[PDB]
Design a protein around this ligand. Structure first.
Ligand code: YGP
Ligand code: SAH
Ligand code: SAH
Lengths: 257, 260
């Protein structure tokens, strides 16, 4: 028949990976190759392990810390990185067994407490700003600049921001940006000659993690093609180009305080 | 969930609810056109996606209703509790050759690549209605469409209507029930996203058409399309507003039958 079905080659996980790569490039540009004795990163989901893997070439030791123990599943059996849950990390800290010179806080809304951060004395502190477009309630829920306050006087402080150029996203969260990229791409693909419709293939992946604690299933579901297209014409290349253009709109940078 | 302040909310409205609202709008356009006319024998071509609904509704006005599809597996959409007679197209052609069918109402829902004008021309209905599958202009969809070649054998002797369905101030590429369903839900999800405190809103859509036309699995189709239309991550309870937004987007859809 005249109507074809086309899945994009780009998967949801390819979009999340491209966004993590951009976020890390912003941190890399900020750090300019500074070397560290001990790095602590708070927050595994969704790009903390990628960050840890990348920073480990610049650090003697890297700790990746999460309040949820099941997040251990995202951290490879390698030893250039140590996963700790938050309670294990607190215990190490009370014992004087950790003393990081770089801290990266990726925990975002409702995340790690300023008061706890204030107990540390790093050379460099980077916090990810979870905010996106102006929103009274998300702004009120955010306390990013309270997390930076204990460090301004003595450390190099950076605030990591990620936005979509001339497009609306409500947060800088890797998943939020992924959803908005793929939904927007589906609308632009719809407009292409001969296309009847284009489905963004998205699921509530966060529930598989935070409710079901099932990393294998999370990974299986995010490997799905990003978009499925019903069309009279072969538009795969155009659709890939559209997804690429929407990814290239995402802009990540570190604000130095 | 992810953190105490953040909630996850599914809409009460399901994907199938949106498809049902669109089918109702299409049928009401047909009903308005027909003006209560009663028929001895109705033939509807094309079960997917609103042919069974049309068949059930028209059965009140008709002594016999046939619902005909080129695909035999489409029978699974016709419940066991009605008078509708399903036939595949080969069976219907044989009935015609035997002189056993002679409809006075024909409704053609087959759309692009559908039933042939030459075959339609074998009939002499009192009324002929064809669904125009087009939406906003697209050169390839427009060239593929042959709606007005299908009306041509009937203009002279019959009451002829062409059903058009579109969205106001929005682009949809076809009038297809599924197309309109997708576009409605994706658009609503973007408007819901914008509400105060919302982090993201996912349109919950799958390639249902594949479950039917290549897996031939009616049950799985119906199960999957019953999913909540939108899933929302949010600081605030926006359920009522989200339902309202989804309702506003459904109400952009308008259907009318053009009499030729
Ligand atoms: C080969 C053949 C052609 C034929 O006339 P058609 O051009 O197919 O259709 C005639 C009417 O069909 C309608 N029509 C034709 N093309 C169009 C069109 O592009 N858009 C709309 N809205 N209406 C159209 C007009 O009302 C015409 O008066 C008839 C009636 C026939 O029996 N055989
Ligand atoms: N106090 C805390 N300490 C360590 N991890 C925390 C925490 N509170 C929340 N988390 C973890 O931090 C993550 C928050 S979601 C953060 C998403 C990230 N900023 C992105 O853009 O992808 C989750 O992995 C959660 O389990
Ligand atoms: N020649 C033919 N005769 C009868 N049914 C046909 C046909 N060609 C396609 N069909 C059937 O017609 C339907 C086409 S999809 C039609 C979609 C419909 N107009 C809507 O808006 O929802 C399918 O059920 C298909 O199996």
């Amino acid at each position: 028949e005249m109507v074809k079905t086309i899945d994009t080659k780009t998967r949801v996980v390819d979009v999340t990976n491209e966004i993590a790569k951009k976020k890390y490039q912003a941190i890399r540009d900020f750090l300019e190759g500074e070397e560290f004795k001990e790095v602590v990163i708070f927050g595994v989901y969704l790009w903390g392990n990628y960050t840890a893997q990348m920073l480990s070439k610049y650090a003697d030791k890297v700790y990746l810390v999460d309040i949820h123990e099941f997040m251990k599943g995202f951290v490879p059996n390698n030893n250039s990185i140590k996963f700790l849950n938050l309670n294990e990390f607190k215990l190490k800290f009370i014992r004087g067994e950790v003393n990081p010179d770089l801290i990266v806080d990726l925990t975002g809304l409702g995340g790690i407490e300023p008061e706890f951060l204030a107990k540390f004395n790093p050379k460099v502190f980077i916090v990810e700003d979870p905010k996106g477009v102006f929103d009274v309630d998300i702004y009120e829920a955010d306390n990013t600049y309270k997390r930076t306050a204990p460090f301004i006087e003595k450390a190099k402080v950076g605030v990591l921001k990620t936005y979509r150029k001339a497009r609306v996203s409500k947060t800088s969260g890797t998943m939020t940006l992924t959803i908005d990229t793929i939904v927007d791409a589906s609308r632009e693909i719809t407009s292409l000659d001969g296309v009847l419709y284009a489905i963004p293939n998205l699921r509530y992946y966060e529930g598989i993690l935070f409710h079901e604690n099932d990393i294998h299933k999370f990974l299986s579901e995010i490997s799905q093609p990003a978009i499925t297209i019903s069309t009279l014409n072969d538009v795969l290349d155009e659709a890939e180009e559209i997804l690429s253009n929407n990814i290239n709109l995402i802009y990540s940078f570190v604000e130095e305080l």
